[PDB]
Design an enzyme around this catalytic site. Structure first.
Site, short mmCIF file in Angstrom:
data_model
loop_
_atom_site.label_atom_id
_atom_site.label_comp_id
_atom_site.label_asym_id
_atom_site.label_seq_id
_atom_site.Cartn_x
_atom_site.Cartn_y
_atom_site.Cartn_z
N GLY A 213 -36.40 63.22 22.06
CA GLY A 213 -35.93 62.43 23.18
C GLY A 213 -34.61 61.80 22.86
N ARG A 214 -34.16 60.94 23.77
CA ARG A 214 -32.87 60.29 23.59
C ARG A 214 -32.88 58.99 24.41
N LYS B 189 -29.94 55.51 25.90
CA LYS B 189 -28.64 54.86 25.78
C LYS B 189 -28.39 54.30 24.38
N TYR B 190 -29.46 54.01 23.63
CA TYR B 190 -29.33 53.28 22.37
C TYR B 190 -29.98 53.94 21.17
N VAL C 11 -34.70 59.69 19.39
CA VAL C 11 -36.01 59.76 18.75
C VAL C 11 -36.34 61.22 18.44
CG1 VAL C 11 -36.58 59.03 21.08
CG2 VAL C 11 -38.40 59.92 19.60
N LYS D 289 -37.25 56.94 15.39
CA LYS D 289 -36.34 56.41 16.40
C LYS D 289 -35.11 55.89 15.67
CE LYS D 289 -36.17 53.11 20.26
NZ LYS D 289 -37.01 52.29 21.18
N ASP E 231 -39.96 46.32 30.38
CA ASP E 231 -39.52 47.68 30.66
C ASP E 231 -40.73 48.57 30.90
OD1 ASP E 231 -37.77 49.72 31.19
OD2 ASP E 231 -37.17 50.06 29.10
N1 LIG Z 1 -44.66 57.57 19.24
C1 LIG Z 1 -44.09 58.52 19.99
N2 LIG Z 1 -44.70 59.73 20.06
C2 LIG Z 1 -44.13 60.69 20.80
N3 LIG Z 1 -43.01 60.64 21.52
C3 LIG Z 1 -42.43 59.44 21.42
C4 LIG Z 1 -42.89 58.35 20.70
N4 LIG Z 1 -42.03 57.27 20.84
C5 LIG Z 1 -41.09 57.72 21.63
N5 LIG Z 1 -41.26 59.02 22.02
C6 LIG Z 1 -40.40 59.80 22.90
O1 LIG Z 1 -39.10 59.22 22.89
C7 LIG Z 1 -38.69 58.93 24.24
C8 LIG Z 1 -37.74 57.75 24.26
O2 LIG Z 1 -38.09 56.81 23.22
P1 LIG Z 1 -37.72 55.28 23.38
O3 LIG Z 1 -38.41 54.43 22.31
O4 LIG Z 1 -38.08 54.86 24.76
O5 LIG Z 1 -36.15 55.16 23.14
P2 LIG Z 1 -35.23 54.44 24.18
O6 LIG Z 1 -33.74 54.67 23.81
O7 LIG Z 1 -35.51 52.98 24.13
N6 LIG Z 1 -35.53 55.06 25.72
P3 LIG Z 1 -34.95 54.08 26.98
O8 LIG Z 1 -36.15 53.58 27.87
O9 LIG Z 1 -33.97 54.93 27.87
O10 LIG Z 1 -34.21 52.90 26.44
C9 LIG Z 1 -39.99 58.75 24.99
O11 LIG Z 1 -39.82 58.91 26.39
C10 LIG Z 1 -40.87 59.83 24.36
O12 LIG Z 1 -40.63 61.11 24.93
#
Ligand SMILES: Nc1ncnc2c1ncn2[C@@H]1O[C@H](COP(=O)(O)OP(=O)(O)NP(=O)(O)O)[C@@H](O)[C@H]1O
Ligand SMILES: [Cl-]
Ligand SMILES: [Cl-]
Ligand SMILES: [Cl-]
Ligand SMILES: [Mg+2]
Length: 329
Positions: A41-42, A44-45, A48, A63, A151
């Site tokens: 995934g990805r 703004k900050y 992962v 992450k 969030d």
């Molecule tokens: N424990 C996990 N297991 C599997 N996939 C994960 C896990 N944690 C995160 N992901 C994946 O990573 C994506 C984004 O991770 P996230 O912690 O939300 O980073 P983020 O930059 O904060 N996203 P955002 O809401 O745009 O700020 C999720 O939508 C999942 O697809």
């Protein structure tokens, strides 16, 4: 000013080092103990990855936090450590960093997620009652630790539908609740922003998460996600006002002595409250019950003080049988 109905004084009583994330000194682990395996995934900050423990090979989630400010890195880390082990919270396993670039990485448990766009159309009446209950257990727990998630949305609620395990993830926007603090309203995601974020009510509390849960619950039982499909922050309040009604919005504005922009006031207009039964159709009637409507109705309120707490929600009649299956163990 406005204060939370529950868990008001948690951060007042706790020692300062519990909530003073600014002064936290991270005890980093060995960064070379993990390696990426596949980007998952990805954002703004961050970016992962599905990683893998170098030794056990046991999978995990890495992450890798992009160049964010150190104050916000410490905030997310400190919140994840305070909430570690709580019910249905994503488990932070380790915190590492490069030592050369000082780039930090958060190591989480891995979750076999099913994306909500694929999973939600296949959920049943019982599935929704169970999963919303598991999410309520997570929200009540983090609220009891004096923390707002800020969030809550389907993209941040991981569900392994085969094991029926749920995990609330992404705590980068979470904050400690201090009574009387004015917070940033540029939080959460557009479709799940509470009215307090759209009218610049800055002394919001845990009840913001209950509105976001209400938007999720409405989109699930009505099979119409996102339920409030606003195209920007101003149109978001317009989409809400045509459902909830403007007359309760006016009462909300008068109570807290707020006022809408001249431009936004023209878009909101005047609208009657629409009954929730108007959103039932042949495609979603099997998911909609009188108990479901009453529970949803008590979440989507303009006045954040009238929204159910998480514990008040878990006690609703909509969850009666889920509690029956839980107490039997
Ligand atoms: N424990 C996990 N297991 C599997 N996939 C994960 C896990 N944690 C995160 N992901 C994946 O990573 C994506 C984004 O991770 P996230 O912690 O939300 O980073 P983020 O930059 O904060 N996203 P955002 O809401 O745009 O700020 C999720 O939508 C999942 O697809
Ligand atoms: Cl912030
Ligand atoms: Cl109704
Ligand atoms: Cl609560
Ligand atoms: Mg996310």
């Amino acid at each position: 000013m406005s204060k939370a109905r529950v868990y008001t004084e948690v951060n007042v009583i706790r020692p300062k080092d519990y909530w003073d994330y600014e002064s936290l000194i991270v005890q980093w682990g060995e960064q070379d103990d993990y390696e990426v395996v596949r980007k998952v995934g990805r954002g703004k900050y961050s970016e992962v990855f599905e990683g893998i423990n170098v030794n056990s090979k046991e999978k995990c989630i890495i992450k890798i936090l992009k160049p964010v400010k150190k104050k916000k890195i410490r905030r997310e880390i400190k919140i994840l450590q305070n909430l570690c082990g709580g019910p249905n919270i994503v488990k932070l396993l380790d915190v590492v960093r490069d030592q050369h670039s000082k780039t930090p990485s958060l190591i989480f448990e891995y979750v076999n997620s099913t994306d909500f766009k694929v999973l939600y159309p296949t959920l049943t009446d019982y599935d929704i009652r169970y999963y919303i209950y598991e999410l309520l257990k997570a929200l009540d727990f983090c609220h009891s630790q004096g923390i707002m998630h800020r969030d809550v949305k389907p993209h941040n609620v991981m569900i392994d539908h085969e094991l029926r395990k749920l995990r609330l993830i992404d705590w980068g926007l979470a904050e400690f609740y201090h009574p009387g603090k004015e917070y940033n309203v540029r939080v959460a995601s557009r479709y799940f922003k509470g009215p307090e974020l759209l009218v610049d009510l800055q002394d919001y509390d845990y009840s913001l998460d209950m509105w976001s849960l209400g938007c999720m619950f409405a989109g699930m039982i009505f099979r119409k996600e996102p339920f409030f499909y606003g195209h920007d922050n101003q149109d978001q309040l317009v989409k809400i006002a045509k459902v909830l009604g403007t007359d309760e919005l006016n009462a909300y504005l008068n109570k807290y002595q707020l006022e809408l922009d001249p431009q936004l006031e023209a878009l909101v207009g005047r609208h009657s409250r629409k009954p929730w039964s108007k959103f039932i159709n042949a495609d979603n009637q099997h998911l909609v019950s009188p108990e479901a409507i009453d529970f949803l109705d008590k979440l989507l309120r303009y006045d954040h003080q009238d929204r159910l707490t998480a514990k008040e929600a878990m006690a609703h009649a909509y969850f009666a049988q889920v509690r029956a299956a839980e107490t039997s163990r």
